[PDB]
Amino acid sequence: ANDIDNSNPVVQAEQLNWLHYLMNYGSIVANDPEANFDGVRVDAVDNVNADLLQIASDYLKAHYGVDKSEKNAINHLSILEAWSDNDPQYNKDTKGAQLPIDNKLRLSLLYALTRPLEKDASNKNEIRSGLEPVITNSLNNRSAEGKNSERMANYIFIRAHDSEVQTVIAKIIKAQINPKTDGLTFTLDELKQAFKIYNEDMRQAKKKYTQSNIPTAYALMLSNKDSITRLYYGDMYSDDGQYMATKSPYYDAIDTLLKARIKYAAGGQDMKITYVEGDKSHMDWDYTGVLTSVRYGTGANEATDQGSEATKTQGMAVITSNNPSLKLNQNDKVIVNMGTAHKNQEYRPLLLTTKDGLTSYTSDAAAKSLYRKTNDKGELVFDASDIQGYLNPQVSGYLAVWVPVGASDNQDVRVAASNKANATGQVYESSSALDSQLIYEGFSNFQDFVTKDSDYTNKKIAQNVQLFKSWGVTSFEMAPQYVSSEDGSFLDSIIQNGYAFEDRYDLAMSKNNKYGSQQDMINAVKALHKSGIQVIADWVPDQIYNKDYQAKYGGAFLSELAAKYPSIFNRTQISNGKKIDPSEKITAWKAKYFN
């Protein structure tokens, strides 16, 4: 493991050369422009690598014109891995071309929904919070008093390949397999033993290790205005085993929410907590907060907006408690204001919590008899017969989603990208068009190695494109495709592909990666493009492991890039106070380019 010296202007030129290779991989290697990557995931890791964010952003502007229209920006959707303590402000202050993480809301969701109650807990900080932070503690404050400040473009997730997976396995191994584990380094046999317990724990009502209320997390993220959700592979399927071989217990609930977002999620948003009095004598944790989140549908931005009759079948309500023992007394009410656009209108449940889990309703007719009609002010009223705390595999508390009756089967409330430049001059301005995008992180670190060729991740991706389309996936984030090194160090033990590599330019070419052959990779990218889904490339310029493809392609494109995109070469970089130096090609990594 060697840290690359990204303060060196010749290295900075090589990192640009590599970015160009990844995004034009099809044209350069396969002579096939349908096998190119559309967007990039930038993972700079360290503050010393700051300059690479401006180099990447300058390339995306010059090559794709992402700064010249919303359309160009949305058609090359790019993201920033968690980097600084304020990625949104840093990306804005620099004129950067990547979506930042809404890290504040990610932590608000984890601590309000997924952590255990006080009794069954690790320490004071791993105690489940109230729901109040889910409204206010976000890059975009969604309270009545906070929603009117400038909105910031962002992506949100509850889990990822590198987030809220390994840390759970580490707990299981330390508790039950190998006390005196140092985390970080595990054997394949330790992982296999841990994943048997992990998979059992995830399917239980009482979760010792895994996250509570994952469906509730998705209901809130997918219905939120001014955000793009990144769906995690491991929330739909098992984090271990063959690719897409076993569904997660949460598959059906999240599938229901993904389809409903396309059909109903539009117009303005209001969020509110109602503190019911409660029974208390029949309650453990005394928290009586019930969160509601309403979308008004196209044409209505506020509770008082009229809308039109042609938008009546849009909008939705999410109702949630995070308290498994919540009981309303017989006088308690939760009022949900669906808006003045939704007076005297029939609503039916999409999702309801029961003793056993979540009931999903695939049509209006499936839920006839559960129909409820708003009053002349546009209010639904729920009481003790509707809302109750439950403890089941799906829910710790209560989850309901309500939708207006009468939507057509193929109703789609998503908005096309504007052809105009953003007035604010940002690459990504928060909008209904940007909210219409959804990213899928389509891999887990802990996928099993294949038994036969038919198991390969990249073959399965090409075979299931229409499933991804039905979920509203506009951007598919593929695993890093670099041929893996084989040694002691977690990225090499599980061969997650890139992350641990000896050749930056070797994408399943000297041999298969974990995910299949060069042709399997190419065909997955082509299949996704044929149904209009973008593919994101994984740009990881921090490290390299120790006549390859670095030799063939190293510095090969700098002449062409200098001729076409001079703006990239004219910038004086902040950290070293120098322009990038393309006068030397890096055809082999040596000590001179490390630290």
Author numbering: 423 to 968, 1006 to 1054
Relevant lines from the article:
Streptococcus mutans, a known etiological agent in the pathogenesis of dental caries, expresses three genetically distinct types of glucosyltransferases (Gtfs; also known as glucansucrases): GtfB (GTF-I), GtfC (GTF-SI) and GtfD (GTF-S).
Initially, GtfB-CD, like GtfD-CD, underwent proteolysis during crystallization setups at room temperature, which we only identified after the structures had been resolved since the gels after purification appeared to be satisfactory. Unfortunately, the catalytic domain of GtfD is not complete since crystallization resulted in the structure of a truncated protein lacking approximately 200 N-terminal residues of domain IV. The truncated model of GtfD-CD is likewise similar, but our attempts to co-crystallize acarbose with GtfD were unsuccessful due to the absence of key binding residues in the abbreviated GtfD (residues 421–1054).
